[PDB]
């Protein structure tokens, strides 16, 4: 009371409480420990700026920790943003002959330092995403093409794969799952109920009747979906998103299935499949053609759209 006497920021009511003794260590425990520091060579995403969302490699980490020099893909029009593309020195000279040079392979154009077609520019710590980074094959190939060896580095990429595989797995009641770790390893079972997103009650299937009448709550981190041949499954995510069909071949991690829309075999990883007995695909907000549109096929051909798909159409002449 004496310490708070004479202060105006303290509220009118004596909103004081006794801190528990166990909480004493927690009140002074540190934060942001997950990441000792930013590691050079890692791939990160940019929060804002003209390169908002472009993946960037951390070439250098500044000792201050507020900024860091990064390797980026340039976005210029050379004289609303242009698409990312490797720095073309010849086109830059043609559109702007005021290029400066300082070393071999290190090019300075328009006040920006480009090393062998890649921009090297310092960016602040508050402008970067260092977690939940989603990499693309195109940007990966574009970054590792200059090292004369395609995607030679695969540790961080494998870690990104592990993270995407772990997060993309969503469960539903009745799904057949298999156990990877624990004492119940290599056991089959059906999901009975789902509580929150980390505890899943599973009823196991076995030759003993007394075991089949028991429900076991199992963490989602030790469950792998079981896909049987001849089941309707709908793709969760990927290039073949929202494609449905019947499973034909189960090559472990990779599953092959005959599609319903394209009616052709498609090979997608098992992590991208959900057992959906019906397609019910809506084609709205796609293409340029509503259903039953009278579309000009070519110079002297016309027809009417009969069925519509994500990347194809059926036309009756």
């Amino acid at each position: 009371n004496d310490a708070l006497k004479g202060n105006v920021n303290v509220f009118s009511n004596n909103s004081k409480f006794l801190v528990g003794i166990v909480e004493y260590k927690d009140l002074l425990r540190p934060v942001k420990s997950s990441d000792v520091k930013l590691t050079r060579g890692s791939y990160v995403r940019v929060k804002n700026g003209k390169f908002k969302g472009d993946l960037a490699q951390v070439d250098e980490v500044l000792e201050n920790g507020l900024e860091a020099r990064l390797k980026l893909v340039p976005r210029l029009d050379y004289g609303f943003r242009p698409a990312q593309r490797l720095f073309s020195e010849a086109e830059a000279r043609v559109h702007e002959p005021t290029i400066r040079r300082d070393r071999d392979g290190f090019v300075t154009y328009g006040g920006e330092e480009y090393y062998e077609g890649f921009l090297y520019k310092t960016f602040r710590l508050q402008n970067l995403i260092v977690n939940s980074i989603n990499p693309t094959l195109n940007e990966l190939s574009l970054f590792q093409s200059n090292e004369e060896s395609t995607t030679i580095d695969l540790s961080t990429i494998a870690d990104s794969l592990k993270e995407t595989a772990k997060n993309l797995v969503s469960f539903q009641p009745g799904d057949n799952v298999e156990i990877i770790n624990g004492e119940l390893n290599h056991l089959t079972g059906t999901v009975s109920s789902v509580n929150q997103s980390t505890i899943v009650s599973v009823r196991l299937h076995s030759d003993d009747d007394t075991i089949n009448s028991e429900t076991v709550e199992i963490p989602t981190s030790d469950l792998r979906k079981i896909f049987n041949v001849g089941d309707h499954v709908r793709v969760i995510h990927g290039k073949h998103t929202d494609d449905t069909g019947l499973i034909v071949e189960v090559n472990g991690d990779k599953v092959e299935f005959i599609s319903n829309q394209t009616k052709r075999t498609v090979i997608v990883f098992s992590n991208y499949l959900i057992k959906s007995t019906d397609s019910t695909v809506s084609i709205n907000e796609s293409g340029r053609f509503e259903l039953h549109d009278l579309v000009q096929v070519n110079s002297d051909l016309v027809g009417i759209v009969i069925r519509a798909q994500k990347d194809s159409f059926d036309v009756l002449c």
Binding site: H292, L294, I304, I306, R307, L316, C317
Partner: peptide
Amino acid sequence: NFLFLRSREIVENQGVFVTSSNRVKTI
């Protein structure tokens, strides 16, 4: 001269069948 018609009983192409206007009579 072609009329694109929608019909209930022709399930083969979701009711859409093509005929010339000379083949039809109005009801």
